């Protein structure tokens, strides 16, 4: 009859995706741990040539290492749900979100440092890039401030259709509050850093196209690679999140097929974004001759 129009939309999940997700998460854990540990070792073994970039890379590697350290519990939760308790849900979510925000903001600050060092090299503004310590401390504090909502408003949620989750419980109107809270990661995590990076790197490229240095081309390639990597890693997740927000807000018509598609896309894009902890050491640090030479020396 016509009652088929009104029917529950059964949530769908598969075990093959579970197995694949576990494999990917474990591989990422191992790779990120290795890379971050190597970077920290190289930077800290010798105090000679401790420059601003070294400090920024140190903080970034620390953040990525903590993110990787938190990953495995997230993988187990994706496997069978949150059986580990409320306290661990709070702590792990706090640590993960803090490190994610810190990594993004440190990438933006690195872009700013490069802009100041190249475009304003001959000016007096480049003397303001010796404040790495205070800037990084402020970035960490701001990341901590922006992740309080996760610690305060998260707990274990037990449903019938689906396994338990480390979700948010803000009250009766939890859905809309969660939608609003989602604005912070998409503003202080995607848009602001992306705009800053684009501005700084574009002016940097404009200066570098006008110069006669032999090694300009490789710098252009590296900057383009960094921007493209950031986009590939983060844009899909935010686009899917925006689509979900619109679908909940009825701007886009809601249907079960769209729900399943968006859930799968969220899982895939979270997996894709998680790759930022493994590629940052290669893109930002290991592509420099100084780091490679230091590593080879340390292996002695």
């Amino acid at each position: 009859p016509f009652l088929l129009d009104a029917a529950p939309c059964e949530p769908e999940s598969l075990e093959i995706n579970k197995y694949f997700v576990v494999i990917i998460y474990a591989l990422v854990f191992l790779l990120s741990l290795l890379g971050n540990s190597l970077v920290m070792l190289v930077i800290l073994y010798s105090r000679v040539g401790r420059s601003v970039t070294d400090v920024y890379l140190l903080n970034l590697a620390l953040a990525d290492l903590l993110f990787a350290l938190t990953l495995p519990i997230w993988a187990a939760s994706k496997v069978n749900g949150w059986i580990f308790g409320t306290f661990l849900c709070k702590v792990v979510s706090l640590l993960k979100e803090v490190n994610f925000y810190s990594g993004i903001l440190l990438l933006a600050c690195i872009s700013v440092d490069r802009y100041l060092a190249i475009v304003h090299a001959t000016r007096t503004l480049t003397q303001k890039r010796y404040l790495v310590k205070f800037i990084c401390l402020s970035i960490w504090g701001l990341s901590l401030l922006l992740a309080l909502p996760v610690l305060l408003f998260r707990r274990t949620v037990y449903s019938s259709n689906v396994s338990p989750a480390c979700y948010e419980d803000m009250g009766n109107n939890t859905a809309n509050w969660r939608m609003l809270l989602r604005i912070l990661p998409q503003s202080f995590g995607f848009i602001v850093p992306l705009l800053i990076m684009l501005f700084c790197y574009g002016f940097t490229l404009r200066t570098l196209f006008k110069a006669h240095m032999g090694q300009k081309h490789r710098a252009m390639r590296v900057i383009f690679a960094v921007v493209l990597i950031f986009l590939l890693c983060w844009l899909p997740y935010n686009l899917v999140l925006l689509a979900d927000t619109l679908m909940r807000t009825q701007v886009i018509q809601e249907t079960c097929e769209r729900r399943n598609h968006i859930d799968r896309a969220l899982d895939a894009t979270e997996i894709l974004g998680i790759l930022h902890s493994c590629l940052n050491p290669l893109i930002y640090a290991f592509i420099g001759q100084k780091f490679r030479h230091g590593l080879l020396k340390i292996l002695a």
Binding site: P8, C9, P11, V157, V162, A165, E168, T174, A175, D244
Partner: protein, 65 residues
């Protein structure tokens, strides 16, 4: 991500065909109460929480004898 279980709602179903009534209260999953009716046919429907029909159905089911 947790989502509501009932996208569209129905108000008319014969009580004699109802076997189960599952009530989800307001919480993180959804912002509105939602009642799911599982019939003897093996199908499922989403009733209107605010309709008079639900209360009478529940009263009848709890007073079979």
């Amino acid at each position: 991500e947790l989502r509501c279980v009932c996208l569209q709602t129905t108000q008319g179903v014969h009580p004699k065909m109802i076997s189960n009534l599952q009530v989800f209260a307001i919480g993180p999953q959804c912002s509105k109460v939602e009642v799911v009716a599982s019939l003897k046919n093996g199908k499922e429907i989403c009733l209107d929480p605010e309709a008079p029909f639900l209360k009478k159905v529940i009263q009848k089911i709890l007073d079979g004898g």
